[PDB]
C-alpha cells in the first residue's frame, strides 16, 4: 500500500482478482502526438513522412531542385501558464534544413554543379500539454479522435429495396486515403457498370480496354474454357469430372443416363465425350478465328455460334473450338453480356469515353485523355492508397505482394471485379460497414500530418514555379519558402476544425472523458441528417472497444462514443482489447491484444466464469461468445478470457456503483450527468464507490503527484518542497523538488481550479504519491459530490415529479456551495474622434461610485462589488450632438453642460456579486503606462525575485547538504569552518598547490552560479516587462476577475450517479424535516415513485450500503471518543476489513500505531466501500454490514414527522446517497426583458440572456393562440412587441400614461419581404 492509500483504505467488495491494471487514460492523445512530433528513421509517420512525400521537388525544365535533410523543433517563446495569461498559442518553431542543388545544363543531366545548405523557418507547431491538451490563443482545447471508414475496397448490396422485384443489386466500392472513388455495380439486367467519383454509369469493358486488354483476353480472365474437337469425324468434348455432377452420352463402356450417380461412373475416368450439334448452337464463342485464304474474321469473340458458323468452320478446316462456360447458378454470362452492350471497340475509343464522362462538353484529345486516366488512379501525386488501405485491399482481394504500393494496377482492378462476380455467383459475402474492423480511429497526429502536408503542397507549387525561371545564382533556400501558408494550415486545423473542441473542465472526469471521446462527425465523417439507425446502433464488435452506455442523448445519439476502459489503438488505427490466454485448460495471466477481425474466430470466456485453485475453469460448460453470438461452450474449447469486469464500460460508467441493477437508459443519464458536476468548497469522498476514483484523479493531472520519493521538506498552501531520497538522485543534482500549486484559477466553464496540500512537513512520500488535491479530489480520490442523508418518502407534494426537498442545514454548512470565477474585459481603443482613455474622471458620476476605484480608474483588489458598480473607468470622445429646443431652454435656465466625453465604462453585470481577486493590464508598445500598470509591474518583479531567490536557496541548501555528505565521507569539524565568515571563505590565502587549486575551483563555481542566476533573472524580467501584441487599433486592455460564492437554492439541479436528477423545490427548516428516534433529521427527502418505473434499483442498494458505512463510521467515532485502547481499535478494523469473502487482504497488524490512528481518524466520517461494476457487493454483504453497525437489516427506520411529532405509519428507507450539483443553475437561467435592443434588419428583439433578448413566439404558439381565439393577444405579440416601431413606442408611452391601448401597424418584416420580392423583378403591391 502507498502512503496516500494507507491513510484511508477503501473496503473492497469485489471477489475476482485483477490481472491487468488499467493503463494510462490519456495514452490515445500522447502516443498520437509523439508519433506526429518525434523523428522516425524509417520515415513512415509524422513530419518526416510529409517531408519525404513532398520533397524532393523538381523544376519542370530540370535545371535545379530542392532537397530535404532534417528538421528540428526550437525552444518555445513562452510556457503554458504564460501562453494562457497573454493569450498566445503554446508552440515550437519548426526549423528544417534544406539543400538547393543546381545542375549543369551543358553537362549531362544529373551532374551536381552547385549545392547550398540552409535552415528555413516553416512555421510554429502547437505543442501538446503533458495532460493531452493544447493551448490555442490562451485556451485549453482537446482534439477529438475520429471514427471513419478505412481506405480500401468494400462490397455491399441494396438489400433488394431498389428494383420493383427483389433483385438484390451488388456493388463494389474502392475509396483511397486521397484520390478518386471507383464503383463497380450491377444493374437489373445483370450487367456490371462503372462510376468514377459517382457520375453516370458506363459499361465495364472500358476500364479493361484502357489497361490494354483485348476481348479474347477479357474472356480468358473472366471465364473458364471448354474445348471441342473433330476426332474421327465426330464431335469430341474435353471432359472434366466436376462439371457434369438431357442428351445421349458417349463412352459406350460407361454410358451415363441418356436424356433422363455421376461420381460412381466417373470413378474410372475417361476423356472422350461426343455431343450433339445443338450443344454448340446455344453457346458463345471464345477466340477470334481467321482464315488464311479469305483473310476475314469468320467468327468473333462473344458471338453465339450458329449452324451456319459450324459449316463455315467445317469448310475452313478448323477442328478445335474453345468456348466459354455459362451456368445459371455457379457461373454467369455477366462479362460477356457487358461486352455485348459495350460500344467501345479499342483502347482509344475507351479513353475518349472516359474523357466525355469526366469532362462533358469538351473536345476530347488523345494526349489529354491519356494524362487524365494516368492521373486518376496510377499517379502517386493524386492517388495514395495508404498502408492501412493497401493492407485492407490486399486482405480483401487475397493479394500477398505489393505492400509498399499506394497506386492501383491491373491486378487490383481485375481482382476486385473477380470478387464482385464471385459474390454474385454465391461464393463470398458482402462486408459489414458498421463492423469495427472496417472502421478506423484517426487521432490528432494523423490530422495534423494531413494538414501539414496540405500546407507543404501549397508552398511547393510556388517553389516549383519559381525554380523554373532559371535566374538562381544569388538565391538561397530561405528565399524560396513562405511559411505563411503552412502556418495558416496548422492554425486552421487547431483553431477552426470541428474536432478541435473547447475543453470541458467542470471536473477531472469531464476532462478525461473529453480526451477519450471518438466522433463519427467532422471532416471525412458523417452528417447528423445523413446518419441512419444502423450507424447509431451498438454493434457486437463494440465489446471491449466502445462503451454501449456512454453516448449523448439527442440528435448525436450513437454518433459520439467513448473509449472503453482497456481499449487501445493498434499501429493501423483499429481498436483492440486485451484478453487472457487459456493454455492447456489453465487461465494464464499473459495478455494478448485482439482486434475485431482476430476476435471472431476465437471463443472468449467471461470474467464471471468460475475458476478453480489450479487456475482452470470449474463449470464443464461455460458461457462464452464466438463470431459475435453468445452461447454455452465446452471448457476445453475456450481460447480466451476477459481481463476485467469493467472492460466493456467507459470510465464514467465504471464510476456508477451497482450499475448491474440499473437500466441502460438511466445508466446513460448517470454517466452523462457525472460530467456536469461542479466542485464545491470542501471535497468529500464517495462512501459507496467502485475503486476507480484513484485512477481518474491521478491520470487527470489535476493533482500534484510526486516525481521522486523523499521527505517533504516544506509545506505551504502554495508550495510543496520535497527533499529527494539519496537512491533517486541524478549525479550532480540539487536534490530539491518544488511543486507550485494552482490557486483559484478560472476554468473554461467559469469554475474554480484550486490545489490544496494534503501533506505535512517531515512525512515520507514515494513516487506516484499525491501531494496536493486538485478540484473534486479528496486524498487522491475523485470527489464529485457530497454524501447526503436520504429518506425515500413523499412529503406534502414538495417532491412531486422529480422535485427535491432539502433541509436548511445543508445550506448552513455549505455542502453544495461553489466558487465561480468570471472574467470581465475593458478595451480602450482608438477611434476617429480620438483615443479612448482609462481615467477616473467619469462625467455625471459622483464620488460614491468612485470609492472602489484608484487614481488610474481601476478597481482595487479585494473590493466587494455588486451589480452596476464601476470596475474600470473609461471615457470615449464624442462629437457634436444636436439638442432639442426644450433642452436648449433647459440649459439656458440652468447652465450646467459637461458633455465633451461619454461614459463607456466596464460595470459589474446585474445579479452578480463578488470580490475582485486579480486585475491584469495589457498596454501596447508605444503607449504610456498608467500608475496601476507600473504598480502591477513592480509587484510582478518583486514576486519573481522572491520566488527565484527561494528556489535558489532551497537548491543551494540541498546541493551543500550533498557536498557536506561527500566531505563527511572523510570527516572533519565544521565549527572551525563556521568560525570564518561565509564570504570570508573567498578571502582565504592558500600557499600549497593542492589547496590553492581547490580554492580556484570554488571561486569559478561561485562565478558560474552567479552567471546562471543572472541569466534566469534577465530572461524572466524581459518576459514580464515587454509589451503586448494587441489587435490593430487597440490601445489598452484591462481584465478583472470576479469570484462569486453561489449557494444552493430552489431551481438548482441536483442528481446522483444512477440517472436520478431533480430540481430543488423547497429549503425546509430543520424542525419540519423527518427525524429518527435519536433526533437526527434527514437532509434530503426523495420521491420513491421515481424508482419502480425507471428501473434504477442501484440507488436503493447504494442507500443501504451508505447507511451501513456511516454506521461503522459512528462506531469508530465513538471508539475514538472514549479514548479506548488501540488493541480493540485494531480488532474492530480487522473485523470490518474481513467482512465478506473478498479479494482484499488488509492486515492491520502490520500497520504502526500512528498509521492505525491516522486510518481511524480518516474513517470517522464513514467507511469508504468499493463495489466494482458487475463484481459488486451482494445483498448478504450489505445486510452483514448493517448488522455490524447495529442497524436494521431491512435498511428501513421509524421516522417521525417534525411538524406533528407523529410516527409515520410505515418504515421509511433512510441512508446515504452521493449527490452532485450539476452546472445547471437557476442563477444562469433566469431572464426577463421589458424593452431592450433590436435587430438591425428585422427590427425585432435580439435573442439570448447575454443580449438581454426576448423569448420566441414560434409557429406553434401562434397555432395555440388561434385555437384559443385570442386574436388581440396574437396581434399584440406580432405587431407591438416585435417589429412595429411606431406602434411599440406609442404602446410604451400609453402604458406610462396608464391607457393600455394599442394602435397596431405594419410589421417591418412584411415590408422587408415586399422589398425582396420587388428586387426579384416581381411586382407585389397593396390595394385599397
Amino acid at each position: 500500500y502507498s502512503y496516500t492509500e494507507k491513510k484511508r483504505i477503501r473496503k473492497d467488495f469485489g471477489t475476482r482478482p485483477q490481472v491487468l491494471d488499467i493503463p494510462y487514460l490519456l495514452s490515445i492523445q500522447l502516443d498520437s502526438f509523439e508519433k506526429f512530433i518525434e523523428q522516425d528513421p524509417e520515415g513512415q509517420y509524422g513530419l518526416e513522412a510529409a517531408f519525404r512525400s513532398v520533397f524532393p521537388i523538381q523544376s519542370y525544365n530540370g535545371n535545379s531542385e530542392l532537397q530535404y535533410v532534417s528538421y528540428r523543433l526550437g525552444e518555445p517563446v513562452f510556457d503554458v501558464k504564460e501562453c494562457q495569461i497573454r493569450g498566445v498559442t503554446y508552440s515550437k518553431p519548426l526549423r528544417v534544413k534544406l539543400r538547393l542543388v543546381i545542375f549543369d545544363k551543358d553537362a549531362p543531366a544529373g551532374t551536381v554543379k552547385d549545392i547550398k545548405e540552409q535552415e528555413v523557418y516553416m512555421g510554429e507547431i502547437p505543442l501538446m500539454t503533458e495532460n493531452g491538451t493544447f493551448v490555442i490563443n490562451g485556451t485549453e482545447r482537446v482534439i477529438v479522435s475520429q471514427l471513419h471508414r478505412s481506405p480500401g475496397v468494400f462490397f455491399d448490396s441494396d438489400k433488394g429495396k431498389t428494383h420493383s422485384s427483389g433483385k438484390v443489386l451488388y456493388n463494389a466500392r474502392i475509396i483511397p486515403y486521397r484520390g478518386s472513388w471507383l464503383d463497380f455495380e450491377f444493374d437489373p439486367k445483370d450487367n456490371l457498370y462503372v462510376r468514377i467519383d459517382r457520375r453516370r454509369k458506363l459499361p465495364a469493358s472500358i476500364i479493361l480496354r484502357v489497361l490494354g486488354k483485348t476481348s479474347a483476353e477479357i474472356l480468358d480472365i473472366f471465364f473458364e474454357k471448354v474445348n471441342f474437337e473433330v476426332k474421327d469425324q465426330t464431335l469430341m468434348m474435353e471432359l472434366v469430372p466436376e462439371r457434369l455432377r438431357t442428351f445421349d452420352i458417349e463412352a459406350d463402356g460407361k454410358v451415363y443416363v441418356e436424356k433422363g450417380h455421376i461420381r460412381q461412373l466417373e470413378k474410372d475416368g475417361v476423356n472422350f465425350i461426343e455431343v450433339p450439334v445443338e450443344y454448340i448452337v446455344g453457346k458463345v464463342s471464345a477466340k477470334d478465328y481467321v482464315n488464311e485464304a479469305t483473310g476475314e474474321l469468320i467468327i468473333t469473340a462473344n458471338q453465339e455460334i450458329s449452324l451456319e458458323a459450324l459449316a463455315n468452320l467445317s469448310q475452313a478446316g478448323y477442328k478445335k473450338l474453345e468456348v466459354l462456360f455459362t451456368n445459371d447458378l455457379d457461373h454467369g454470362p455477366f462479362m460477356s453480356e457487358t461486352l455485348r452492350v459495350d460500344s467501345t471497340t479499342d483502347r482509344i475509343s475507351a479513353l475518349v469515353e472516359i474523357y466525355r464522362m469526366m469532362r462533358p462538353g469538351e473536345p476530347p484529345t488523345k494526349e489529354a485523355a491519356e494524362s487524365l486516366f494516368e492521373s486518376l488512379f496510377f499517379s502517386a501525386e493524386r492517388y495514395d492508397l495508404s498502408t492501412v488501405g493497401r493492407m485492407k485491399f490486399n486482405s480483401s482481394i487475397g493479394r500477398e505482394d505489393a505492400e509498399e504500393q499506394g497506386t492501383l494496377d491491373e491486378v487490383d482492378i481485375i481482382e476486385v471485379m473477380k470478387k464482385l462476380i464471385s459474390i454474385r455467383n454465391g461464393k463470398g459475402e458482402v462486408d459489414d460497414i458498421d463492423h469495427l474492423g472496417n472502421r478506423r480511429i484517426r487521432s490528432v497526429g494523423e490530422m495534423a500530418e494531413n494538414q501539414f502536408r496540405v500546407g507543404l503542397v501549397r508552398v511547393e507549387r510556388a517553389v516549383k514555379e519559381r525554380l523554373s525561371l532559371g535566374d538562381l545564382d544569388n538565391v538561397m533556400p530561405q528565399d524560396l519558402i513562405n511559411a505563411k501558408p503552412i502556418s495558416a494550415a496548422v492554425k486552421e486545423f487547431f483553431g477552426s476544425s470541428q474536432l478541435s473542441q473547447f475543453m470541458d473542465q467542470n471536473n477531472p472526469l469531464s476532462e478525461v472523458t473529453h480526451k477519450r471521446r471518438i466522433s463519427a462527425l467532422g471532416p471525412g465523417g458523417l452528417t447528423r441528417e445523413r446518419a441512419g439507425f444502423e450507424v447509431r446502433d451498438v454493434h457486437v464488435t463494440h465489446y471491449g472497444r466502445l462503451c454501449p452506455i456512454e453516448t449523448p442523448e439527442g440528435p448525436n445519439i450513437g454518433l459520439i462514443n467513448s473509449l472503453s476502459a482497456f481499449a487501445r489503438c493498434n499501429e493501423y488505427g483499429f481498436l483492440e482489447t486485451p484478453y487472457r490466454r487459456v493454455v492447456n485448460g489453465v487461465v494464464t495471466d499473459e495478455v494478448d491484444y485482439l482486434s475485431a477481425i482476430e476476435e471472431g474466430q476465437f471463443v472468449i470466456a467471461q470474467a464471471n466464469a468460475k475458476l478453480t485453485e489450479e487456475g482452470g475453469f470449474a463449470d464443464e460448460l461455460v458461457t462464452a461468445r464466438q463470431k459475435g453470438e453468445s452461447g454455452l461452450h465446452p471448457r476445453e474449447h475456450v481460447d480466451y478470457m476477459d481481463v476485467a469486469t469493467n472492460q466493456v464500460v467507459s470510465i464514467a460508467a465504471s464510476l456508477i456503483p451497482f450499475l448491474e441493477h440499473d437500466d441502460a437508459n438511466r445508466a446513460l443519464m448517470g454517466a452523462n450527468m457525472q460530467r456536469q458536476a461542479v466542485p464545491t468548497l470542501r471535497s468529500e469522498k464517495p462512501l459507496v464507490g467502485t475503486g476507480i476514483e484513484r485512477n481518474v484523479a491521478v491520470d487527470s493531472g489535476v493533482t500534484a503527484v510526486a516525481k521522486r520519493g523523499g521527505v517533504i521538506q516544506s509545506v505551504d498552501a502554495s508550495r510543496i518542497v520535497v527533499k529527494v531520497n539519496e537512491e533517486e538522485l541524478i549525479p550532480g543534482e540539487a536534490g530539491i523538488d518544488i511543486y507550485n500549486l494552482t490557486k483559484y484559477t478560472r476554468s473554461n466553464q467559469n469554475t474554480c481550479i484550486n490545489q490544496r496540500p494534503c501533506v505535512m512537513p517531515g512525512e515520507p512520500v514515494a513516487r506516484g504519491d499525491v501531494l496536493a488535491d486538485g478540484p473534486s479530489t479528496d486524498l487522491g480520490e475523485l470527489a464529485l459530490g457530497q454524501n447526503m442523508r436520504i429518506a425515500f418518502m413523499p412529503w406534502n407534494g414538495y417532491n412531486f415529479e422529480d422535485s427535491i426537498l432539502v433541509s436548511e442545514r445543508v445550506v448552513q454548512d455549505d455542502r453544495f456551495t461553489t466558487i465561480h470565477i468570471q472574467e470581465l474585459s475593458c478595451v480602450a481603443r482608438d477611434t476617429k474622434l480620438g483615443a479612448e482613455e482609462i481615467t477616473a474622471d467619469i462625467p455625471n458620476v459622483g464620488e460614491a461610485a468612485l470609492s472602489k476605484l484608484d487614481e488610474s480608474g481601476i478597481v482595487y483588489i479585494g473590493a466587494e462589488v455588486k451589480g452596476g458598480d464601476i470596475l474600470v473607468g473609461k471615457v470615449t470622445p464624442k462629437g457634436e450632438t444636436q439638442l432639442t429646443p426644450e433642452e436648449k431652454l433647459l440649459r439656458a435656465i440652468f447652465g450646467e453642460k459637461a458633455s465633451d466625453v461619454k461614459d463607456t465604462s466596464l460595470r459589474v453585470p446585474n445579479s452578480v456579486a463578488g470580490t475582485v481577486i486579480d486585475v491584469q493590464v495589457f498596454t501596447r508598445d508605444g503607449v504610456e503606462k498608467d500608475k496601476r500598470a507600473l504598480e502591477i509591474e513592480q509587484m510582478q518583479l518583486k514576486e519573481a525575485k522572491k520566488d527565484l531567490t527561494e528556489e535558489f536557496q532551497i537548491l543551494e541548501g540541498g546541493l551543500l547538504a550533498r557536498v557536506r555528505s561527500v566531505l563527511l565521507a572523510g570527516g572533519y569539524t565544521e565549527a572551525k569552518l563556521s568560525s570564518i565568515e561565509r564570504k570570508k571563505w573567498l578571502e582565504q590565502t592558500l600557499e600549497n598547490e593542492e589547496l590553492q587549486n581547490q580554492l580556484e575551483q570554488l571561486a569559478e563555481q561561485y562565478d558560474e552560479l552567479k552567471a546562471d542566476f543572472d541569466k534566469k533573472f534577465e530572461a524572466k524580467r524581459r518576459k514580464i516587462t515587454q509589451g503586448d501584441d494587441l489587435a490593430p487599433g487597440v490601445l489598452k486592455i484591462v481584465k478583472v476577475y470576479l469570484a462569486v460564492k453561489r449557494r444552493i437554492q430552489p431551481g438548482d439541479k441536483m442528481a446522483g450517479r444512477h440517472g436520478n436528477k431533480g430540481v430543488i423545490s423547497k429549503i425546509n427548516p430543520v424542525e419540519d424535516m423527518p427525524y429518527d428516534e435519536n433526533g437526527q433529521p434527514v437532509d434530503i427527502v426523495l420521491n420513491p415513485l421515481g424508482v419502480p418505473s425507471r428501473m434504477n434499483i442501484g440507488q436503493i442498494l447504494e442507500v443501504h450500503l451508505g447507511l451501513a458505512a456511516k454506521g461503522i463510521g459512528d462506531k469508530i467515532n465513538q471508539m475514538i471518543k472514549e479514548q479506548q485502547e488501540l488493541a480493540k481499535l485494531r480488532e474492530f478494523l480487522q473485523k470490518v476489513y474481513d467482512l465478506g469473502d473478498t479479494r482484499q487482504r488488509v492486515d492491520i497488524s502490520e500497520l504502526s500505531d500512528e498509521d492505525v490512528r491516522t486510518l481511524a481518524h480518516n474513517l470517522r466520517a464513514g467507511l469508504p466501500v468499493a463495489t466494482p461494476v458487475f463484481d459488486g457487493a451482494p445483498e448478504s454483504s450489505i445486510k452483514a454490514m448493517l448488522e455490524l453497525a447495529d442497524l436494521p437489516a431491512s435498511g428501513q427506520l421509524t421516522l417521525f414527522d417534525g411538524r406533528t411529532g407523529d410516527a409515520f405509519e410505515r418504515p421509511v428507507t433512510v441512508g446515504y446517497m452521493y449527490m452532485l450539483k450539476l452546472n445547471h443553475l437557476v442563477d444562469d437561467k433566469m431572464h426577463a426583458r421589458s424593452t431592450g435592443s433590436y435587430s438591425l434588419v428585422t427590427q425585432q428583439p435580439l435573442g439570448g440572456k447575454a443580449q438581454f433578448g426576448g423569448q420566441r413566439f414560434g409557429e406553434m404558439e401562434v397555432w395555440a393562440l388561434e385555437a384559443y381565439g385570442a386574436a388581440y393577444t396574437l396581434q399584440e405579440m406580432l405587431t407591438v412587441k416585435s417589429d412595429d416601431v411606431n406602434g411599440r413606442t406609442k404602446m410604451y408611452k400609453n402604458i406610462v400614461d396608464g391607457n393600455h391601448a394599442m394602435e397596431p401597424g405594419m410589421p417591418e418584416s412584411f415590408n422587408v419581404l415586399l422589398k425582396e420580392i420587388r428586387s426579384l423583378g416581381i411586382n407585389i403591391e397593396l390595394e385599397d
Binding site: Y121, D479, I481, N482, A483, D1029, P1032, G1033
Partner: protein, 52 residues
Amino acid sequence: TINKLNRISRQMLQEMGREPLPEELAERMQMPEDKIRKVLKIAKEPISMETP
C-alpha cells in the same frame, strides 16, 4: 504599399524566425511607425453576416 509590406514581412520572418514587430518593419521600409500601423489596420476584408 500593403504588398511591399507583406513581402518585407515575409523576408524578415524567414530571416529572424518570428513575426516582425511594427518598429522593425518601419525601420526596414523607411517610413514612420504611424504610417505602417495605418497600412496595417486598413488591410482588412469585411466579414459575412452568414458566418456560422
